[PDB]
Amino acid sequence: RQWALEDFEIGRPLGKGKFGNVYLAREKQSKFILALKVLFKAQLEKAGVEHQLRREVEIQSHLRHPNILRLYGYFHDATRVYLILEYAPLGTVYRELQKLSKFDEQRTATYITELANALSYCHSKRVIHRDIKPENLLLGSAGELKIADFGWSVHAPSSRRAALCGTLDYLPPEMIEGRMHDEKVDLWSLGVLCYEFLVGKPPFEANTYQETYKRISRVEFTFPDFVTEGARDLISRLLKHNPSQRPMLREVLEHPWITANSS
């Protein structure tokens, strides 16, 4: 279980990050292709995220699902921290969306069930991702969804407001205004994503932070003409200010529009 930088051959930079980037890497002894999250120790302390990184490692290493990016192990040196994660061959859902502008009802529903199934596993172990966004969703060889970047992930109903600033597009009312958040946070993020996948943009996307804050707090979104009644229904049920009004993940999986359009 003991790793070092010299045991790997570094390749193409897969994606850009905040505290460090993701690179393609091969383990010399096995020829195993994987992803390396190189995070600089200096930037971690100068923001106070060292504990959240340990929470990320603690969570992701014990989680085992075909729609959750596996964390094989970790190591560090006199400068950086390294996360040995699985490599998603088909890239991010973010690029997939940028390329296609918007997705069809089939693709949206398939991604929704896949995400829900992975969240159903997460919530059965009482683990909340909180940062469910296309930037954190990846794609395997089969084109299957894969949840990554468990940085803001927490256990039990917590008050540890971590995302704070940055884009709030996917954070529910509870998270944006302190109030203790639970599993329902991901159910909100699910609707944000279902909307975004069909429309090409998030339901509350504004020009400023304070602008988006209003739209999230008042839950003010408007569907375009090309949005189906079935799609509109699922999104309306998911995007409710009150958490107890949002449905259980099984109801999402059961939903007519989901079953009629999924795979």
Ligand X SMILES: Cc1cc(Nc2nccn3c(-c4cn[nH]c4)cnc23)sn1
Say if CB 252 and CB 112 are below 8 A apart.
yes
Which residue in the list 7, 77, 104, 131 is annotated as catalytic? 131
Classify strands 127-128 and 71-76 as parallel, antiparallel or unpaired.
unpaired
Stretch that binds ligand X, among 14-22, 49-57, 107-115, 232-240 (CB under 6 A): 14-22
Sequence-distant (≥ 6) Cβ neighbours of residue 246 within 8 angstroms: 184, 187, 188, 237, 238, 240
Closest CA to 49 of 160, 207, 171, 195: 160
Q: Does 22 bind ligand X (CB under 6 A)?
A: yes
Name which position in 19, 23, 37, 97 contacts ligand X (CB under 6 A).
Answer: 37
CB of 204 to ligand X, least distance (A): 25
96 labeled part of a ligand binding site: no
Quick count: other Cβ atoms within 10 Å of Cβ 178? 9
Classify strands 32-40 and 71-76 as parallel, antiparallel or unpaired.
unpaired
C-alpha torsion angle, residues 133, 95, 93, 218 (rounded to 10)? 30
* C-alpha gyration radius of the chain: 18
131 noted as active-site residue:
yes
Q: Does 13 bind ligand X (CB under 6 A)?
A: no
CB of 14 to ligand X, least distance (A): 4
- CA 237/CA 228 separation, integer angstroms: 14
Name which position in 25, 84, 97, 148 contacts ligand X (CB under 6 A).
Answer: 148
136 labeled part of a ligand binding site: yes
Largest CA distance in the chain: 56
Sequence-distant (≥ 6) Cβ neighbours of residue 37 within 8 angstroms: 17, 20, 21, 22, 82, 83, 85
Q: Does 88 bind ligand X (CB under 6 A)?
A: yes
Map the footprint of ligand X across residues 61-80, applying CB under 6 A: 69
Name which position in 112, 118, 127, 138 contacts ligand X (CB under 6 A).
Answer: 138
- CA 16/CA 18 separation, integer angstroms: 7
Stretch that binds ligand X, among 84-92, 152-160, 210-218, 255-263 (CB under 6 A): 84-92
Q: Does 35 bind ligand X (CB under 6 A)?
A: yes
Quick count: other Cβ atoms within 10 Å of Cβ 25? 23
Map the footprint of ligand X across residues 90-119, applying CB under 6 A: 91-92
CB of 140 to ligand X, least distance (A): 9
In the block, residue with structure tokens 């988006």? 212
Stretch that binds ligand X, among 86-94, 153-161, 213-221, 249-257 (CB under 6 A): 86-94
Total interface residues for ligand X by CB under 6 A: 15
Q: Does 82 bind ligand X (CB under 6 A)?
A: no
Name which position in 49, 53, 68, 85 contacts ligand X (CB under 6 A).
Answer: 85
CB of 111 to ligand X, least distance (A): 17
- CA 133/CA 94 separation, integer angstroms: 8
Residues forming the site for ligand X (CB under 6 A)? 14-15, 22, 35, 37, 69, 85, 87-89, 91-92, 138, 148-149
Residue numbers in the known binding site are 18, 37, 86-88, 135-136, 149
Which residues are designated catalytic?
131
